[PDB]
Amino acid sequence: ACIQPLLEIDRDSGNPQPLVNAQCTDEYYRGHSALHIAIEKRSLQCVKLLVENGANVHAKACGHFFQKNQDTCFYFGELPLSLAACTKQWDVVNYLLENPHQPASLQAQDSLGNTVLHALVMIADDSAENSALVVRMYDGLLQAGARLCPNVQLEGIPNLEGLTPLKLAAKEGKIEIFKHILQREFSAPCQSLSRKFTEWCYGPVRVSLYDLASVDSWEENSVLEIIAFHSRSPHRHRMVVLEPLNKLLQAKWDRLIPRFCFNFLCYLVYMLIFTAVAYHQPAGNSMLLLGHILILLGGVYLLLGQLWYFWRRRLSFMDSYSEILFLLQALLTVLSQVLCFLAIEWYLPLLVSSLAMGWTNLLYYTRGFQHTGIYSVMIEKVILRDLLRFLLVYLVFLFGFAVALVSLSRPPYRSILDASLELFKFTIGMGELAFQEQLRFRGVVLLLLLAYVLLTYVLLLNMLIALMSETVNSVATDSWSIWKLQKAISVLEMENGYWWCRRKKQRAGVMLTVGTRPDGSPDERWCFRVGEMNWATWEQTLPRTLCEEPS
């Protein structure tokens, strides 16, 4: 009851700065206002009453409680309409849009650049209860924006990074709203906000068109490039399998199979030349000088290509494993030929080390096939995860027992390294244990060898059952989707061209008139066709088609 007479009193006194537009002053709670409180407390009547007296509906609540990544904070954006949208209050959003005094604007964006659609992207994590809220409020705000301001396209407005809500949902890793936005069908009042159409439906077969406005890799800063090279989430291999993306990447791979085979044969010919030059090193001196020159050129080529990769689209151990191994082999090759040109005589271990490393890098090209590509994915995952803690524990046990046997044996076990070598021979199955008959302390040496053998059998058995428990309690589609993500990164690399000659890339998909716009010229969109077959289509209603007869 006290609100209306108090505002009448504050208007009667004649202040220069009003009471109803009041901002909190603290650093933790800066810029907060009574309108944010009224929207938080779910009271529509107090919102109407504060609006009619003249509350600022674009008040930017920029406090430290209202920022993104601080602990136990609520990031809704700054504006009141973004708060009303995030807090599931539909009638408050409706009144704030359609009031006669001081209308809230959908184009209005916060200090971080985010509009209300970006905020609805940011709040989503995972549930039915969060996801249904976010998709319903997203669709409702788009339809309300088409009603109130038809010329503005609300999904075009970017953040301060330069991202639209679709690119933001791709980067932050939100699967549910990204999957909703890519395939979105609207009805007869406003159908031009759709991204999915049906071109024709002759019986059970039909042809669905998908829009590729920001999805195609032809335009810079795509969705495909953001999933491949800019997203940091562990959701990245799941987002590649979705409905317009899988067929598009399969089409690009089927276009680019010949260049993959050509790059394979070029690398194989390089490694055979490098093998013959490292074998015949020790007339023929002319052919060996030509061979050394070709190896130096190949090393400079691979080194510059990998440096251009790391400069261009990076800034990350498991994701960039292949590029690291190619970089090490290239640097060791160039360094070894520099030392052979200067004759520093240490060129031969670097030469054979880069030779072995270059032959074992031939498993990069086994990702063209599924049957062996998933196998090399598993080799990466075994080397990076499960081998290193085993080596940690094993080297602790090994050098503890080595120093014990060196110091207890006062010709057997002369030094720490020569005792480590015999204790490592026990692991292979080549090591010798016996009753020495010359040492004074024979029984203790034999007891320590028996204990070492039992402990390392325990360690190997543990490693095996740890891998079995990790693999048997795992989803089958994960290895398949990691392989698909590797192919997607590979096809986006082959599309960009070689480093010495940048390629002129082409659009994908046909250009056709999808409909009429609200104003003037008809809607003209680049679309990608996916054929579909469904046998329950006789029950549901027939959708509107762009064409009549299948072509």
Added chain:
Amino acid sequence: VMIEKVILRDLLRFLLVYLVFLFGFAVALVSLSRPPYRSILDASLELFKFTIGMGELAFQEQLRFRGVVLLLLLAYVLLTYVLLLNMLIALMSETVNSVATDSW
């Protein structure tokens, strides 16, 4: 039935990967060792003996580059243990997620 399905499916890609690793390391040891490892075949035979459990490794004390030979042998042993471990868990991922009526 299981013998045929093990031979045709699992063993051949393992042999592919293993022979790539094997002959890469064999040519490296032949060229690095300037009486040990006299030829490509005679060094491939020793690196294959390491898989049986019969293979001899030592600090050679006559070659100039002893430590690099020892380091390459240690790396070969770890990589082949990784490959056999992978083959085993790949068969277990095929066999755990299968219907029991199918072999019958």
Added chain:
Amino acid sequence: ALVVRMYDGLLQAGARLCPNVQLEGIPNLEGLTPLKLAAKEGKIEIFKHILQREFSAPCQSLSRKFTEWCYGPVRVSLYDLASVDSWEENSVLEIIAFHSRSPHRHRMVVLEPLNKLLQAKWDRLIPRFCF
């Protein structure tokens, strides 16, 4: 469900009949209140009930879980640490750790007021562990 229903009913009835006496303070001859007994004997369901307990308008002081504020979906909930804290002698944490003999000890450490408190102790004691 029987034990939690009758436990709450007895607390409300004793709060009505004899208000000054607190029933949950009276110890056994072993020295234990019912929360320490539920922690010691290994009973997960009633221990989990007592640690997060909310009562209503007639008898509100019998709760052990309070909400300090709720701004939208976020809230800060206040949990009482009367016998849970390791400052006092013969705690619930000491009884779960040492004096319990059940096979259910490791399941009782993961409960909602305990997980955050033990993480907040471990993040403070990291440097002495490295030392």
Added chain:
Amino acid sequence: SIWKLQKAISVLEMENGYWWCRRKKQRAGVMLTVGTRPDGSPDERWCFRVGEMNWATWEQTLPRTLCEEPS
């Protein structure tokens, strides 16, 4: 959870102190007034703050709060 129990035993042992220096232990959590008792003075309890995020809060009934603004 077995590993969490191991860290719990470790943090109790480090909190108790060494044998040669019996360390003085400190209370955890803030002390604040929760409400009034049925007899006389208000209740002052030592409490531990746990933050939570819940999107089912709108359909349910709103609980009693001890403070007004999030501070």
